[PDB]
Design a protein around this motif. Structure first.
Motif, short mmCIF file in Angstrom:
data_model
loop_
_atom_site.label_atom_id
_atom_site.label_comp_id
_atom_site.label_asym_id
_atom_site.label_seq_id
_atom_site.Cartn_x
_atom_site.Cartn_y
_atom_site.Cartn_z
N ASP A 24 7.73 -15.75 -60.89
CA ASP A 24 8.70 -15.46 -59.83
C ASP A 24 10.12 -15.33 -60.38
O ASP A 24 11.10 -15.66 -59.70
N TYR A 25 10.26 -14.87 -61.62
CA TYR A 25 11.54 -14.52 -62.20
C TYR A 25 11.33 -13.30 -63.08
O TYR A 25 10.36 -13.25 -63.83
N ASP A 27 11.56 -11.16 -66.09
CA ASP A 27 11.89 -11.25 -67.50
C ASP A 27 11.75 -9.91 -68.23
O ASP A 27 12.18 -9.80 -69.38
N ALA A 38 7.46 -10.76 -55.94
CA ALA A 38 8.56 -9.90 -55.54
C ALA A 38 9.74 -9.97 -56.49
O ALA A 38 10.84 -9.55 -56.12
N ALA A 39 9.54 -10.48 -57.72
CA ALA A 39 10.69 -10.87 -58.55
C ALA A 39 11.39 -9.70 -59.24
O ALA A 39 12.57 -9.83 -59.59
N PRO A 41 12.85 -5.75 -59.58
CA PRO A 41 13.26 -4.64 -58.71
C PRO A 41 12.46 -3.36 -58.91
O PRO A 41 12.38 -2.55 -57.98
N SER A 60 9.21 -5.33 -54.03
CA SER A 60 10.02 -5.86 -52.94
C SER A 60 9.26 -5.99 -51.63
O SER A 60 9.78 -6.58 -50.68
N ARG B 724 17.20 -9.43 -54.60
CA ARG B 724 15.93 -8.79 -54.25
C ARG B 724 16.12 -8.04 -52.93
O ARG B 724 15.88 -8.58 -51.84
N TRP B 797 16.10 -20.96 -53.18
CA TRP B 797 16.40 -21.64 -54.43
C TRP B 797 17.35 -20.77 -55.24
O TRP B 797 17.61 -19.61 -54.89
N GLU B 799 17.87 -18.70 -58.39
CA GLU B 799 17.06 -18.08 -59.42
C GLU B 799 17.87 -17.62 -60.62
O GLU B 799 17.27 -17.32 -61.66
N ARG B 800 19.19 -17.59 -60.52
CA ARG B 800 19.96 -16.97 -61.59
C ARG B 800 21.44 -17.31 -61.39
O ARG B 800 21.91 -17.43 -60.25
N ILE B 836 24.28 -15.09 -68.65
CA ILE B 836 23.22 -15.11 -67.64
C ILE B 836 22.33 -16.31 -67.89
O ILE B 836 21.66 -16.40 -68.92
N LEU B 837 22.28 -17.22 -66.92
CA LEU B 837 21.42 -18.40 -66.99
C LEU B 837 20.12 -18.09 -66.27
O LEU B 837 20.13 -17.77 -65.08
N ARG B 838 19.01 -18.22 -66.98
CA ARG B 838 17.70 -17.85 -66.45
C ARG B 838 17.14 -18.95 -65.55
O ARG B 838 17.12 -20.12 -65.93
N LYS B 839 16.71 -18.56 -64.34
CA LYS B 839 15.86 -19.32 -63.42
C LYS B 839 16.17 -20.82 -63.39
O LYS B 839 15.35 -21.62 -63.85
#
Ligand code: W9G
Ligand code: CA
Ligand code: CA
Lengths: 87, 853
Positions: A24-25, A27, A38-39, A41, A60, B724, B797, B799-800, B836-839
């Motif tokens: 869910d992020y 990478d 949905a993480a 784009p 999305s 998103r 939450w 996320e970034r 950029i700090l990840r998650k």
């Protein structure tokens, strides 16, 4: 004992650990590490849709509360319960 | 242009009379023998020296450093109007004291200081001071004029319309002097510049809610709404004047060591004016909000994108538009139904052929998590088969003529009558009509648009209601005109609340408005035109409304009249994406311009603008919560944030959202670049597209392309975004947040975030909301509670985190109450100094801290 191996982004670009697939992020620049969430784009979610034609939807639209697939599998943690309508 | 159907000041007999009184020695004088100090007020008699007419001045110091001046007749033949329902409360008073006196003056102290009021007896005059500094004078030019009710000054005609004027001349007026002020703002609505112009060589600014067909730019003609509030700004202080009168009002502005004089002239009512003494413009915002309230908190969906036109033709068309957004990957929250959805412009009905199953259409839109807005105007077709007309006629709830019959005028359904929205029984009837049992075919995802509520009357004088129509309590229409639309707005908003049992927040767009309309929803600038200068003027028009409390403002994207060329439509989407009320709308005879109908390069630019808006929804929502709680405008002139930078006092091709984002939309065809003024001593600004940092103050030449929207984030701020983008805001409101931290030169930043269920009053009735403070200093980012009373069950939450202006750390460490210390991975661009700090993975409801080592 011997351990397991990591995941590589389909566009090259990067290689990430196995536990960052569907975490869910986003990478991966091509979205390939998140086929089930949905993480990303630019990702896509695959709807198997047995009884009809399989379908790809935008990432999305995974768990957006809207039933995008006839088999309802794009909505699995959203509070929308999609009935199977592939007939 | 055909403007002969609207009165100039010379054609308004009370304005001609008032404006012919020129500055000089006032004949009014205060009889100091009649002076009385009371529990809430000082009262003293005034007299016209020649006519011997006797008036009563009621002078009050108010809590929050404001003064109220009311003047009425001592022995009136019949009562004069005093504006109801606009003030949210009886303003708390402060005690006045006589602290000095001589033969021709009395000095009053408000509470224990520092504010003082000097009442001069002959000639009558008031001076307002802080300690020994003169802030403002009243009647210094001797322009006070009060026409007492006697036993075209009387019967009067204009064009073919006749005003019987049964009470004769009753106009009131008063002048104000603002030493040290060279810039004044406010008194919407006019298609004119943000900084108001001197009226010496032309027309006064007119405040009279009127329907002006194809209105033109840079002129002082009255448009659809009237907010009689004027703000004055200098390098040293801010002041406001709130002229609480609901009748036709004209405003003269003149300059003269530097000084601005303001003169208000109103057809009837009493003199009732609030002086809001600042000293900062945010103090004025708070002062005025305590009087008339604050912006209603919009349901989240209403801050998304609205797709409208006159008219979508049937249910199938609406569903094709809905599906078009999804097929072309463009977000949209609301599709609008203009007057052709009803049965022959009988409101609360549906065309039986083109909208036969409205509940089913609404259910389809609900399955896409979208809403619908239906138009409901206040004119009711004279039609014995129309149940709305029959009920209002049978219960006597219509505006009347002097002979006691119901008023009948002409509007969209032809011959039509006008409910008396000044009557509380009529407003209660209207609100109950929005119940799901009464408004058949409506559903919880159907919201409302009130139009033509000036009220517009096609065969009436100046396209509105006759001055001598009669309202509840016998008041004339000339007495109440400018709050008629507000009452429509209010009763509709109360209807949407009541139909839900008091749970759902309303959404109502209104065309006409007054002081206090911010409490009931949104407004827009009416029928603009698809031309570049109308795109430009949307900024000063919505800024003038923002300054007087109406934060939920916008203009028709693309222009209502005519067909915009594709480049103009792109630029209007980019402009509208950064304005509070964001709706595309268009005239019946225009070509279809849903955004996917354009060539792909224009579609992509418009899609990009829509994505930027949806991503910024948490930011928009928090700015509107701050407006709701404090009365601070969402969209702001640069001078509000930089009160000492005199080069900002007139800027109207740029604006701020809160204190964090500066916007300079492209508003010229073929533009190759823009000149962006970036203010602030020791301030830095970040181009949010390239992350390039820029120091202030400077005018930056920024090259642009078709897809450019020049936007800069201020150093020292933290902007929350939903990265998103989904098809509507309902789909996004449980998604994780990305924090954009723009470091100050001192390595600090701060921001807020408000969250709730997005549509109910539970934030208020149950304190179900979150208000988070995010703050950065040293090398640590901290989330803490900005309001402990708020708790909320939510999956949102973090996320970034994106940090602009930061160096590369050695390690990043997250601490959350309830969790072990964690390590975060990160990426750093040395070119742009972007980290950029990840998650982070932490709940937005949790206290946490991130340390850069
Ligand atoms: C050929 O056309 C048929 C007759 C021409 C009449 C032209 C007068 C147009 C101005 C009306 N403005 C309204 C009403 C509105 O047009 C419909 O409710 C809204 O769309 C709009 O937003 C609002 O300001
Ligand atoms: Ca991942
Ligand atoms: Ca879905």
């Amino acid at each position: 004992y011997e351990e397991s191996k990591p995941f590589t982004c389909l566009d090259g670009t990067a290689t990430i650990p196995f536990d960052q697939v569907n975490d869910d992020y986003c990478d991966c620049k091509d979205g390939s590490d998140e086929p089930g969430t949905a993480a990303c784009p630019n990702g896509s979610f695959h709807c198997t849709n047995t009884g009809y034609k399989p379908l790809y939807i935008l990432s999305s639209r995974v768990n957006d509360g809207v039933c995008d697939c006839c088999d309802g599998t794009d909505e699995y943690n959203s509070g929308t319960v999609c009935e199977n309508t592939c007939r | 242009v055909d403007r002969s159907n609207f009165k100039t000041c010379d054609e308004s007999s009370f304005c001609k009379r008032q404006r012919s009184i020129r500055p000089g020695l006032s004949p009014y004088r205060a009889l100091l023998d009649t002076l009385q100090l009371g529990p809430d007020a000082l009262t003293v008699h005034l007299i016209h020296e020649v006519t011997k007419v006797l008036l009563v001045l009621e002078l009050q110091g108010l809590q929050k450093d404001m003064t109220r001046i009311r003047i009425d007749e001592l022995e009136p033949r019949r009562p004069r109007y005093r504006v109801p329902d606009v003030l949210v409360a009886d303003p708390p008073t402060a005690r006045l004291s006589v602290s000095g006196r001589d033969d021709n003056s009395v000095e009053l102290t408000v509470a224990e200081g520092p504010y003082k009021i000097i009442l001069t007896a002959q000639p009558f005059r008031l001076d307002l001071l802080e300690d020994r500094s003169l802030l403002l004078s009243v009647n210094a030019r001797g322009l006070m004029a009060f026409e007492h009710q006697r036993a075209g000054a009387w019967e009067e005609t204009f064009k073919t319309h006749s005003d019987s004027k049964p009470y004769g001349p009753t106009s009131v007026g008063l002048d104000f002097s603002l030493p040290g002020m060279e810039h004044v703002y406010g008194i919407p609505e006019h298609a004119d510049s943000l900084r108001l112009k001197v009226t010496e060589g032309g027309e006064p600014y007119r405040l009279y809610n009127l329907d002006v067909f194809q209105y033109e730019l840079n002129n002082p003609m009255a448009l659809y709404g009237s907010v009689p509030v004027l703000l004055a700004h200098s390098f040293h202080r801010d002041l406001g004047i709130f002229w609480l009168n609901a009748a036709e009002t004209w405003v003269d502005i003149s300059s003269n060591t530097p000084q601005t004089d303001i003169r208000w002239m109103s057809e009837s009512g009493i003199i009732d004016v609030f002086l809001m003494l600042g000293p900062s413009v945010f103090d004025v915002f708070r002062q005025y909000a305590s009087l008339t309230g604050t912006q209603a908190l919009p349901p989240l969906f209403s801050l998304g994108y609205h797709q409208s036109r006159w008219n979508y033709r049937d249910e199938a068309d609406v569903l094709e538009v809905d599906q078009g957004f999804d097929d072309h990957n463009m977000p949209c929250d609301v599709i609008w139904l203009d007057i052709e959805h009803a049965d022959g412009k009988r409101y609360f009905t549906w065309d039986p052929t083109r909208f036969p199953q409205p509940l089913n259409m609404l259910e389809h839109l609900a399955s896409k998590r979208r809403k619908l807005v239906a138009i409901v105007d206040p004119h009711i077709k004279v039609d014995s088969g129309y149940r709305v007309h029959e009920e209002l006629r049978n219960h006597g709830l219509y505006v009347k003529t002097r002979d006691g019959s119901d008023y009948e005028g002409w509007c969209w359904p032809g011959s039509a009558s006008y409910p008396d929205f000044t009557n509380p029984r009529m407003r209660a009837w209207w609100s109950n009509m929005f119940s799901f049992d009464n408004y058949e075919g409506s559903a919880p995802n159907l919201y409302v648009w009130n139009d033509m509520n000036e009220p517009s009357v096609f065969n009436g004088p100046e396209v509105t209601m006759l001055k001598d129509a009669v309202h509840y309590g016998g008041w004339e229409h000339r007495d109440i005109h400018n709050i008629y639309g507000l009452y429509v707005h209010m009763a509709t908003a109360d209807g949407l609340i009541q139909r839900s049992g008091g749970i759902e927040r309303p959404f109502v767009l209104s065309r006409a408005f007054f002081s206090g309309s911010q409490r009931f929803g949104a407004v827009w600038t009416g029928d603009n035109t698809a031309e570049w200068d109308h795109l430009k003027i949307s900024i000063p028009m919505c800024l003038s409304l923002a300054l007087v409390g109406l934060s939920f403002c916008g203009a028709d994207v693309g222009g209502f009249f005519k067909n915009p060329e594709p480049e103009l439509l792109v630029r209007w989407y980019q402009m509208g994406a950064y304005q509070p009320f964001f709706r595309a709308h268009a005239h019946l005879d225009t070509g279809r311009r849903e955004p996917w109908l354009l060539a792909s390069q224009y579609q992509d630019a418009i899609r990009d603008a829509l994505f930027q808006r949806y991503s910024l929804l948490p930011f928009w929502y928090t700015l509107f919560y701050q407006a709701h709680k404090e009365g601070f405008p969402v969209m702001r002139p640069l001078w509000v944030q930089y009160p000492e930078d005199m080069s900002t006092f007139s800027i109207e091709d740029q604006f701020m959202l809160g204190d964090a984002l500066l916007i300079h939309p492209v508003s010229d065809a073929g533009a190759h670049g823009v000149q962006v003024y970036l203010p602030g001593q020791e301030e830095v600004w970040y181009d949010i597209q390239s992350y390039q940092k820029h120091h202030g103050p400077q005018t930056l030449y920024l090259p642009v392309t078709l897809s450019s929207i020049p936007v800069f984030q201020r150093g020292g701020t933290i902007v929350p975004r939903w990265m998103r983008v989904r098809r509507s805001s309902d789909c996004m409101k449980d998604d994780p947040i990305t924090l954009f931290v723009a470091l100050s030169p001192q390595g600090t930043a701060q921001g807020e975030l408000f969250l709730d269920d997005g549509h109910t009053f539970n934030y208020q009735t149950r304190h179900e909301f979150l208000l988070r403070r995010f703050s950065f200093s040293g090398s640590t980012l901290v989330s803490s509670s900005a309001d402990p009373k708020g708790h909320l069950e939510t999956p949102i939450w973090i996320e970034r985190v994106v940090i602009m202006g930061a160096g590369k750390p050695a390690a990043v460490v997250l601490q959350t109450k309830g969790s072990p210390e964690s390590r975060l991975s990160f990426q750093h661009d040395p070119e742009t100094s972007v980290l950029i700090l990840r998650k982070p993975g932490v709940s937005v409801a949790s206290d946490w801290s991130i340390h850069l080592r």
